[PDB]
Amino acid sequence: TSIRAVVFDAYGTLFDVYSVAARAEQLFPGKGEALSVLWRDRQIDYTRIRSLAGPSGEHYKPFWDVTVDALRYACARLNLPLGNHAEATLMREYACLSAFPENVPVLRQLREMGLPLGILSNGNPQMLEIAVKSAGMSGLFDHVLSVDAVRLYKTAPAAYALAPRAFGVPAAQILFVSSNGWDACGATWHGFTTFWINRLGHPPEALDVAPAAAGHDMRDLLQFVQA
């Protein structure tokens, strides 16, 4: 079926989270890769635990505050000295990230081939908006969407449903792009055409579903559309 719009996940897709791991190392020598791993794990675990526990948003909390919670748990567990300064510093780092250098032109070869572009993110909008301004992609997106509108995190249907609504098109006609295998898979269940930017070369998730195609980077995504 014909793509008529293309929606992106934020972190790891549009925005390289790398710079947080590197700054963790500096505050916590020898413990950066461990913190950053544990922190991402719990950040995601907490969004799922919450949305699963309250399928109508009973336990929702914005992604920012969930990210603080996860960072705090990870430091306590890993026995790291995280008080106000080191916390503020890592969160600042989180607020303002940079793009994968390949992205911004590829977005143009799509904008130019007549394609509306959006972001759909677990990110609360307050953090999603500045995050976008770090990277020079202001203007490229028609819609910048947050699961905060529905108080439910991916893979919840109400989160995926935001993009058909904003674009005025069925899921089947939106190309859904994510770095996270679980999310490409969840989007495929919802009925999008999906592309998985598998940056670390991992296996497909064993979820009995597969995205339409996958590649290694954003420029592989361009390849695929043009075909």
Catalytic annotation, residues: 9
Looking up tokens 């043009």, which residue turns up? 226
Whether residue 210 contacts residue 191, with contact meaning beta carbons closer than 8 Å, is answered with: no
Burial of 173 (C-beta count, 10 Å sphere; 0-12/13-18/19+):
middle
Q: Is 64 in the site for Cl ion (CB under 5 A)?
A: no
Min CB(189)–its own copies separation in Å: 6
Q: Name which position in 13, 51, 146, 194 contacts its own copies (CB under 8 A).
A: 51
| CA-wise closest residue to 211 among 80, 190, 44 | 190
Q: Is 202 in the site for its own copies (CB under 8 A)?
A: yes
C-alpha span between 156 and 39 (Å, rounded): 22
Q: Is 161 in the site for Na ion (CB under 5 A)?
A: yes
C-alpha span between 110 and 41 (Å, rounded): 33
Q: Which is nearer to Cl ion, 6 or 127 (CB)?
A: 127
Min CB(159)–Mg ion separation in Å: 19
- 177 DSSP β-pair partners: 8, 195
| CA-wise closest residue to 175 among 159, 192, 154 | 192
The amino acid present at 57, given as its one-letter code, is: G
Q: Is 90 in the site for its own copies (CB under 8 A)?
A: no
Q: Which is nearer to K ion, 151 or 154 (CB)?
A: 151
Task: Tell me the pairing of strands 174-178 and 5-8.
Answer: parallel
Spell out, one character per residue from 43 to 62, where the chain touches Cl ion: x when CB under 5 A holds, - when not: --x---------xx------
Min CB(125)–K ion separation in Å: 20
Using CB under 5 A, list all residues that contact Na ion: 161, 164
Q: Which residues bind its own copies (CB under 8 A)?
A: 41-42, 45-46, 48-55, 58-59, 61, 69-70, 72-73, 76-77, 153-157, 182, 185-186, 189, 202-203, 205-208
Binding site per annotation, positions for Mg(2+): 41, 45, 76, 79
